[PDB]
Ligand binder design. Structure first.
Ligand code: FL3
Ligand code: FL3
Ligand code: FL3
Ligand code: FL3
Lengths: 214, 214, 214, 214
């Protein structure tokens, strides 16, 4: 699977029962962030679950639903989440997939070389079932959910306002929170663009490098 | 290709002349961060080339050589780097690949659906030539090289102290800059972890969850 | 071949005429215990043919058809069974394979090192034609069909009650004839095991160790 | 691997440190019973460990050393054995192999179809490193160590007194505890045999079926 491809139609067993991806989310007009961990009841994966729960509402606020995955069975997931609630005080409210035959993991390249469990994969999927971004981190290094939060904010703003987002948006080191104006490919993108410029909204470093604020 | 796989043996045309990957970097005991952008003289890509250049020594300090890639030709690259130099004050000092015919981009899954240009891909390759981490951002959303810096700091510390790094390390919400002690793989390591527990050299939330200061 | 593998499609000459394995037994909804002996008119083998015949109805009761095999020819078999009949009072009522050229014996790893005759092999094959258990005893030590009877009782009860059987069941040192409740593979099964725990329908030594009466 | 083949020369990590099979046992003139379980901290495997410990001295009395195996790591083994001691009151005194890359398991066909963990395998290996018998039971059915105890007693008596052992020896249903006298292949086996017969020690059902007592 690559960026731009439809997420595969698949039935998945989860701690919230059976669900049809991507449809379950797409049909509500929801994005999802699908993320793998190698094994339940590991310390890095445990800090990741803590951290994601603490951000569950920053994702959902935007119309993005977290959903986890390992090749462990659903009994493992439950026991482990009960451990996070009793010991860390955070109840897990996002579903987790029991990919217990490794079938989905395998379709999404989530299994590293010589292994039988997933790595630390991340898929952003939009309400059209389109894979918008993919991350593969290894067992030994925990993600940072604040970068995935920035990524989905960027993607949603890109869709909504037809801009591209510079390095480290919205704290880019040349134009801070200003979005780039991409080339026009539509009459409306030529009229939208021209009228932004008559409104003062556009500046530039050259003809091919123009940017505005939202 | 997946995490844990040998980076494919491959000669590449660059702005700094030709090189064999991964041998060129692995024979200097260097890791490389191989990264792509869709096209030279695009503004998001330009923001990321500025950003990488300002950070080029953060990577080099750590023995990690950055290296760019697009399907644009060496002639196009020389033109674009020249523009950045005389327009933003940064000379580009890292080699950029001219991936004639997108042959390496296809090997590494860098081409998004129904395109001939790359997306915003990142590969961390180590001094053994093993792929340690993979990121695929799309054309519309530039990366944050400080997250890739954190990732390769974490990979380096993981290899060097035999530890795993928790979420957002070295700013994990629970244990800060502390590192996860992996399980004992020998009876000798069982005795050493029992000693370290007694001394408080390692600390723990449960028998399976042990961390320490570096 | 290994446990979990389809028994290989194969026509075999027997004392009761020719048959297709596993289809002959699987189309009657029968399991078979396929077992070999090194040579007709050997005394250990004879003791085991007596033993199997006295037990042939214990297996048949359970829908498990016994079936013998050696590299001896049908003519040799007819002679030997005749001897048992008129000498020990038992007619042999189960089919015996004449494995011309040891072709099936090689497929199933029945030939010991630097020999052309089988050892004392046993295969439990189910009504789906799946191999469920394998035993390889040598020429010098005859089997105990009461252990193979216990094994196929246990396999049958495992399939029929969705349980796992403890050591020496139905005479386990700890729980007697009680059976291990496997882990929940669905959220629905989590709720049903929580109900059964509350009712004492299942009993337990720890959260991962639950047994019940059949 | 089949009966009659030398156990492969292999270094194994165990709860008693590193050891060289078969040499570690063969060099002391010891047999070993090598036995797999699928996963540590399972209920069937747990009753098997209980049961084997309770018989550890019936095996060792005979010069046979139990040694266990799963693909779990050595930390898993230790935690699990501590659970057997605290909860069931039996300290495990036999070593257990951490076949944590599945390498030995794979050489000995211990992995069922489509799986990544072992089944319930058993190998008897003599002081010459020769595989004398192999058992494959599935996850769902626990062994009976009393049958493996009978098997090793039979094998040792076969070696020591040049006899073959009938069905269910020493409670065979025709000659009880009497051993079969195999054909002679040596002058000494002709003199040994002839002199047993002059001593009264031999009886028979026919010329090819003779047996004596020990
Ligand atoms: C923590 C966890 O996921 C897990 C899963 C299965 C287990 C089986 C036996 C003992 C402990 C377990 C823990
Ligand atoms: C990358 C860029 O802006 C640039 C600079 C000089 C050029 C000369 C000729 C054709 C294209 C160019 C692009
Ligand atoms: C199996 C046995 O004892 C027996 C019986 C009759 C025979 C006739 C001819 C050749 C061999 C025989 C073996
Ligand atoms: C019981 C056992 O073998 C085992 C192994 C690894 C574990 C990791 C996390 C939590 C519980 C575990 C239990």
């Amino acid at each position: 699977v690559v960026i731009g491809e439809k997420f595969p139609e698949v039935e998945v067993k989860t701690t919230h029962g059976v669900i049809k991806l991507p449809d379950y989310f797409a049909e509500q007009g929801k994005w999802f962030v699908l993320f793998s961990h190698p094994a339940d009841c590991t310390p890095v994966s445990t800090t990741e679950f803590y951290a994601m729960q603490k951000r569950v509402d920053q994702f959902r606020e935007l119309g993005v639903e977290p959903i986890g995955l390992s090749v462990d069975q659903v009994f493992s997931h439950i026991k482990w989440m009960e451990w996070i609630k009793e010991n860390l005080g955070e109840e897990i409210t996002f579903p987790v997939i029991a990919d217990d035959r490794g079938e989905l993991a395998d379709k999404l390249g989530m299994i590293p070389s010589g292994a039988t469990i997933t790595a630390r994969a991340v898929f952003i999927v939009d309400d059209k079932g389109i894979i918008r971004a993919i991350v593969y981190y290894p067992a030994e290094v925990g993600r940072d959910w604040d970068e995935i939060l920035r990524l989905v904010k960027a993607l949603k703003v890109s869709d909504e306002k037809g801009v591209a987002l510079p390095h480290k948006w919205p704290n880019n080191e040349l134009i801070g929170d200003k979005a780039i104006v991409p080339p026009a490919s539509t009459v409306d993108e030529v009229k939208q663009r021209e009228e932004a410029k008559a409104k003062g909204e556009i500046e530039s470093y050259d003809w091919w490098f123009s940017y505005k604020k939202l």
